Structures are given as C-alpha cells and as structure tokens.
Amino acid sequence: ATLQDIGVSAGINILSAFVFFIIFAVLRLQPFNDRVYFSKWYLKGLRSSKFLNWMPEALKMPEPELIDHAGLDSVVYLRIYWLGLKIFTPIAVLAWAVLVMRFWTHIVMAYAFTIWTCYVLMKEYETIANMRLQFVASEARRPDQFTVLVRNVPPDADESVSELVEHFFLVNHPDHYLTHQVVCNANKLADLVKKKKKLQNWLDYYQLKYAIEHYIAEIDKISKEISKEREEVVNDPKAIMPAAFVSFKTRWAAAVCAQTQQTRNPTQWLTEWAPEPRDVFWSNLAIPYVSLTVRRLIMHVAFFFLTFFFIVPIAFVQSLATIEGIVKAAPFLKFIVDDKFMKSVIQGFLPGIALKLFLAFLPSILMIMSKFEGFTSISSLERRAAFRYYIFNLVNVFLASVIAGAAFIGVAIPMKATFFITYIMVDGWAGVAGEILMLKPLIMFHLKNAFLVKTDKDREEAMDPGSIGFNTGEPRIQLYFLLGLVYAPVTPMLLPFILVFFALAYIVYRHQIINVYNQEYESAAAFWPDVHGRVIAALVISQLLLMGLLGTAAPFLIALPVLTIGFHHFCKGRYEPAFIRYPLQEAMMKDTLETAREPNLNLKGYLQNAYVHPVFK
C-alpha cells in the first residue's frame, strides 16, 4: 500500500477502537452483564449480583496487589508489553534522528540497538527472577511443593508398580518418603463421564423448552457403561501405568529428589516436580513414556507440512497487495475501487483481515499437536504451543510474506514495511480494542442463561471467562518484536505502530487481568526463560538479515551474532537458575517456618489423596 493508505487506515482503526470502547462502556453498565465483565471478582467472592475512565482505573492497582489478586503469571505476562516499550521507544527515537558513510551508519546503529536491547533484557531477567523467588517463598501450602512425578518406573515380573515405587523410595530416600499415588489410566471412564454431562445438558435443554425419552434413554445407557467401566478400571492391572506421584515429608526432600538422578540408567525412574493437581493434564499420563520420542518426531513432520501448505494462504494475501490482485480475487469490488476513498480503505484493511482470518484456527491446531506430543501439564502445553506458533510466524508470516512479495531477500524486506504496518493496525490496534468487548463470552453467557439454566446455581458455571491465553498472546508480541528489530534500521516509520500497540495492549490487558480473566495454573513465571530466548533469537535474525541487505566490514557484522549469543549465555548462567533450580536453603526456610507456624499439621492427611484422578474422587 502507499502513505495515504496508511493514513486512511490509521484514521479508521483509531475510530474503530474508539467505537468499540463506546460500545463497551454501554454494555458493562447493564447489570445483566456484570457476571461477564466482572467475572474475576465473582470468582474471588468479592462481588455481589468520560466513558474511558476505565483506563485510569486499570492503572491504579499497585503491582504487588495485582500479583496477589491476579497471580504472578498474569503480572509477568503483562510486563512483556512494558518490555516492548522499554526496548523500542529509544530505538524509534534514535533511528528517526539518525537514519531518517551510510553503510557504516547502519552498522553502528545495529550495535546501538543490540546493546540497548540486551541491556534491557538483562535487567528484566533479574527483575523477574527476584519476583519469582519472593513469590515462591511466600506461597501458601500446595501439594506440589512436596511432590514429584516419577516416570518410566521399570517393569518387574513379580512386583506391582506400587510396590516398586514404595520400595525404591524407602530405600533411597528413607528419611523423608511419606506416601505415593500410582497413576491409573482412566481415560475411557473419563470420556464416558464427560459424554454423560453433555447428554444431561441436552436433556435439561429439552425439558426447559417443553425427544425427552430419547435423551433419557441415552443417559441410562451411558450410566450403565460408566458403572461397568468403574469396576473394570479399578480392578484391571493393565490400567496401571509405570508412573507415580511421590510425596515427601518436607519440601527440602522433594527438592532433592526432583533435582537429582536417581538410578544409573538416566532414562528410568525419571523425576520432575509434580504439577499442581489442577494443572495435571490427566489424559497424557496414560501415554507410555517410551512412545514420547516417536510422537515428537511425528509432530515435527506434521509441523513441517502445516508450515509448507500454509504458504498458499500467505501467497493469496500477498496477491491482494495490489489493487489488481484485489479485483481479480474479488471482481464484485470493481464498482467501488475507482473511488479514491474506498480504494484506500480496501487496500489497507482487506489483506490485513484476510491474513487474520486464515490464521484464526492456527492456535487450535498447534494446541492439538502439543497434546499429541504427550506433555502432562497445562502449563507445559501452553508453553509448547507458544513455541510452535512463534516458529510458524517467523516462517509463514514474516519470511513467506517477504519472499512471496518479491515473487509477485534484502530488497524484498523494505518493500513490505507498508504491509506489515497495515497488518499491525488491524491485528494489533483494532484487535485488542475489540477484545475488551469480549463478545464471545457475552453471547455464550446469555445463551446458557436462556436455555440451559434450571437453577441460579448454574449461573456460576456459565461464568467461565477463560484466561490470558499465553499460547496465543505471547507469539503476537514476539512477532511485533521481530518486525521492530528488523525494520528499525531500514524503515523506522514502522516502529510507532508497534509502540501504540504495546501501549494499548498494556492498558487493555491490565483491565482484563484485574476484572475478567481467571488463572488456570500458577507457574510463577516459569515461562520467562522462553520469552527471553525468543527475543535473543529475534536479535540474531535481524542481524543476519541486515548482513544480506546492507552487504559485507564483515568482522563487525559477524561479531554482532557472536556477542549477542555470548550475552545469552551470561544470562543463562546468572539468572536462569531462579526458574530451573530450587535452592535447598529456600526449601529449608519454608519448612522451618511452616512447622513453627502450624506445629500440628497432618501433612500426610493433606497429601494422601492429592493427585487422585478426578474421575474417581
């Protein structure tokens, strides 16, 4: 597109966001929608049954109160938008002042940008590590603090899994072993129970609307299957997996077990910290450990094909980069593209929206792939989906658009700065502004109340706001960071568009974190090292792309990637341990203080029925 298309599109995206905020201001004041817009307060139990003033209110809660109110993962996520402003605001300013002889100017700027970015990341990594350590030290007792998950318990002809686990731990951790719970494959039973719930909803639907005999018959048949299955899963030795949740008397002991190799064969008796019981992805505990290697290989191949085939939708969007491509793809638009105003509106918004729609189901696919791979916790599944999404964006959204563009790399990049700018305004600015309306929950909330509610108690189930969406949010931020770092030395006018995005997204999400979103698991910012690593990868990619465009002076261009990686290793050595190792001293302090505070705690009673598959509880 051209400058006037950027101008027209910006005018429209600004006005559109403004309108969404007006609609929001109206909907949030209608009392029948409080259960949707203030869901967090209902979940906490703190709430009973101009127009942009919500912005200042979102900013009034101190970060420490937000950590206790919303959780640490929610706060650390939000700080990523803040990181974006810290990294790019001075880049946008210096790039403008200096770049808007030339060969060397570009090299110097590349160093200035890399150093600033690394400096900011170093400071952020230190900050997050300190928040994590304090958060964990003050964290309330929870079963995972004492529990490790043992995988690949070797077989024995005579002894059961339970006997092997009890014996191993009494012998090798004799002072602290307390109790264990063996993993059971109850996937069939769990599916029958979920199916029964769906059938029950249909029966309740038809009863409120009054087919009744049909749904009753399905309920009785499934109830019989459930009863039969409960007997078989409980007394069937093949339902027992060679895995167990092992609990210890102290946190110190659990830390020792979780952080050390137990046997001489490094692939057996594998120990890791257990997920909090609500963070356990129970279905994947039924996957035999040894199959995980093959499953990951298959998904790497499936990912290749997904990335490969998706090139076609990208090429389509790039065809639409010109007005001729637009009318050829959509001939019905010819009558309105002679008009200068509409030509700019369509040229701006159409390829932006088309790409956004094609990518709409991408995170569902990636989450399915992640589940196939066998991860056993919700937090791990979201981190892997974020990983794959990031790679996908690097190849299909960024490089493929640039290459396809040239088909319709050095020169190819500057030619697409405009495309990425209109994309950011549609996906970024208008995108987050519409998210605050949160239309999907309003619609589902009202449909449930209208047809699936028999009692007011059901209205507390209709209220499921979801969560921040680490797996769909983090990859968007990272794409914009990459575009910023790539375009900053060549087309600096891109940067103000990402700065508006980071600022707007920060205020919109801070609002949603406080009033709307729940948190499904608390990983205490365990994801931070991945966020850090992705930024480092983005710096390296930008530096290599610059070599191609600028040209090769090679020792300067080569040193940038080397120095950037050396920085990364410094940080892994110095800050990463706050996320991947649990100091024995810290474990001992919690144990000491807890004992003094609660001298009569029955720890075994507390932990004994934790980690029992919910279908049995």
Binding site: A97, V98, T105, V108
Partner: peptide, 25 residues
C-alpha cells in the same frame, strides 16, 4: 595500565560525542 586507561576513557567519551554529532546533524 590504569594510567593509560583512565585518559583513554576520557578520549573515548569525546570520540562518541563527535561521531554522533556528525551522524545526528
């Protein structure tokens, strides 16, 4: 080498101000 580094640092600060003034304007 403390006796050389200290004034070297001072020379570098001036070198930076000069190079950037040239790039800036």
């Amino acid at each position: 080498f403390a006796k050389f580094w200290d004034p070297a640092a001072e020379k570098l600060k001036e070198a930076v101000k000069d190079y950037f003034a040239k790039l800036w304007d």
